[PDB]
Design a protein around this ligand. Structure first.
Ligand code: 1XH
Ligand code: 1XH
Ligand code: ZOL
Ligand code: ZOL
Ligand code: MG
Ligand code: MG
Ligand code: MG
Ligand code: MG
Ligand code: MG
Ligand code: MG
Lengths: 346, 346
């Protein structure tokens, strides 16, 4: 709602992002075709999602900066840093789609699945990542938060890469152990792979933009935002099987890819020993009838109801955590973002 | 020789690089297995090469800093930033080996060809890249060049990514045009893909470390170092076909992968029209007997002698350029590095 009003202005800022990334180096004409490829890379892989992470930067920045400091320029930078978060997303997703062997993202074919792209997508991703640092220098080089922002985006990438390594190490292809799929391991994976970049990064970005740089106000924000990130990823895992691909824009692969999904952890916690074996025989394999058998087993332990039950308790806990740690920040910052992910199905 | 003395001290600094990258986050035990994977990623993909780029940082830093400023700490940082260049290399190479479909690198199997790695290598690469920025913060956070160094490593990555995009766009699989393979296009490709990160980056890194930050002293260094980078890449293209894989540590793929190699550009400049057609029919295809036919054609126009002739003229020109633009820097800086690549065959 605070999100939904601001969407349109934020999406229109994208034409200029692209202009400035295409223009400022087209005074080197020799790379023109590279630049043209960048444009394509951006339009295919930055557009088409819900923009919530990039919107979170703009919304929070509105709520933390005094409106007499929100000049036209200061807002440009807010929307630009918003788009920097978006490009980080795009970067990890393009590479994740390859490592996860996914088919669709945001309602279209994955970039690496497009005829004539393939594993060139690897360098496409890396460019998306560089564009972040290009814009920071363009729009924020002279701000006193410029270095905070750079360290923040770099630190959040390392964290999410450490998370992916854990994601991939725990899901080796053609190689079961059910046994590594614990709660402790799960929470660790999801903390690093999703929670820093999807929640802490954008709010912190907007904190540094407003001049709130103190270690304690960041750690407290962090406490709320990691826990919301855990919830968000459990939701992502539930939607990978039980979501509607016309809503989510994507087809699940967690069972196939042998993943430490929340579903499988819960499953294992509930399974009779012979249910265990059915899982053993059928998990992490590409065969459609073996996936279907796992799903049935999940359904047979009411894991969709266990998800709906988790969602309520997590929500109540995040809200407790907001009552606890929001101060001295406006609680609307956390509340608007919790509203945005509660009940969600894309 | 200045290189060859300093090698051993530089390579021994690698144990500590790895220690500090493994230690400083092992106070989070939950990621321990990620960290262990990093260690592996580093030992396989940072070790085994000639270290010339990372050595160039240490050598030049010795030559530009007054020896009364080369305290133990100041040298730590030199060797560390040396290793940061090395990790940039490692990052691009791991990804290049995938996009080039290569077999071996540095005398062993490519990381992505190892059983149980595969396309997980994508995230391995990204980590290598993050490690650069981790070390900069660890060893240089309080230096007045810290931000110059960060912008330099980021800018050099964007440039080399723009170069790779050009490299890949000009070499679409199963799709000849001989016709895009010009001199102008060639020089552009090689400038961006190799010349900034392999030559300008390390010397500039060492300039910023010595407090030489002026735009004019950088542009002049740049003028020498881009041209040396062009030469170095033409050498790389010649070795891809005519090099000895026990020296180079790697097997060629430029013809197979349909690349704008220097060899093919030269070829096209020399070809009778019916030689042209032989090239047309045989270039950019995986079939061993069609590659052999191209090689024969290259040999039939004495392109190895044309390479030996280019090498001499380029050398004389780089030396002219050094006479022109080295000032006020010690010419030994450029000379030691030109000695290192003249006559080279790994
Ligand atoms: C799984 C996700 C969680 C993180 C967000 C991300 C978005 C919503 C896109 C998006 C673009 C942007 O510019 C800024 C923020 C964004 O969130 C995509 C569509 C689907 C959900 C996904 C992939
Ligand atoms: C093609 C190249 C040109 C750039 C350098 C690079 C090295 C020599 C490794 C290396 C490691 C390091 O830490 C610092 C510098 C380095 O050069 C590898 C072995 C082969 C040549 C290669 C791949
Ligand atoms: O399930 P994943 O972690 O691979 C995913 O959530 C992507 N992602 C990657 C890192 N954090 C989130 P997606 O379902 O978008 O494929
Ligand atoms: O030939 P390439 O450019 O792919 C190569 O030189 C790697 N490289 C990549 C960018 N710059 C240099 P290598 O021969 O090492 O595979
Ligand atoms: Mg995925
Ligand atoms: Mg994934
Ligand atoms: Mg998922
Ligand atoms: Mg290659
Ligand atoms: Mg290549
Ligand atoms: Mg080569």
């Amino acid at each position: 709602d605070v999100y939904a009003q601001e969407k349109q202005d934020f999406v229109q800022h994208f034409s200029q992002i692209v202009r400035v990334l295409t223009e400022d180096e087209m005074g080197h004409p020799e790379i023109g075709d590279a630049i043209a490829r960048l444009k394509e890379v951006l339009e295919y892989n930055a557009i088409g999602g819900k923009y919530n992470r990039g919107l979170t930067v703009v919304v929070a920045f509105r709520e933390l900066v005094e409106p007499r400091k929100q000049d036209a320029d200061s807002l440009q930078r807010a929307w630009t840093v918003g788009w920097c978060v978006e490009l980080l997303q795009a970067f990890f997703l393009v590479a994740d789609d390859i490592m996860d062997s996914s088919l669709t993202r945001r309602g279209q074919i994955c970039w690496y699945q497009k005829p004539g792209v393939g594993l060139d997508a690897i360098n496409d991703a890396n460019l998306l990542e560089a564009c972040i640092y290009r814009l920071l220098k363009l729009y924020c080089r002279e701000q006193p938060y410029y270095l905070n922002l750079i360290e923040l985006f770099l630190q959040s990438s390392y964290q999410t890469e450490i998370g992916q390594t854990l994601d991939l190490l725990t899901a080796p292809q053609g190689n079961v152990d059910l046994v590594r799929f614990t709660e402790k391991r799960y929470k660790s994976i999801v903390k690093y792979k999703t929670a820093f970049y999807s929640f802490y990064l954008p709010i912190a970005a907007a904190m540094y933009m407003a001049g709130i740089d103190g270690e304690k106000e960041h750690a407290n924000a962090k406490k709320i935002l990691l826990e919301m990130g855990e919830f968000f990823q459990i939701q992502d895992d539930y939607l990978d099987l039980f979501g509607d691909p016309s809503v989510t824009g994507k087809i699940g692969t967690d069972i196939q890819d042998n993943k430490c999904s929340w579903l499988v952890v819960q499953c294992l916690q509930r399974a009779t020993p012979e249910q265990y074996q059915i899982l053993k025989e059928n998990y992490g394999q590409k065969e459609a009838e073996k996936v279907a058998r796992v799903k049935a087993l999940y359904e047979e332990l009411d894991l969709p109801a266990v998800f709906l039950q988790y969602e309520e308790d997590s929500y109540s806990h995040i809200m407790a955590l907001i009552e606890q740690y929001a101060a001295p920040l406006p609680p609307a910052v956390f509340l608007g973002l919790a509203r945005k992910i509660y009940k969600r199905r894309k």
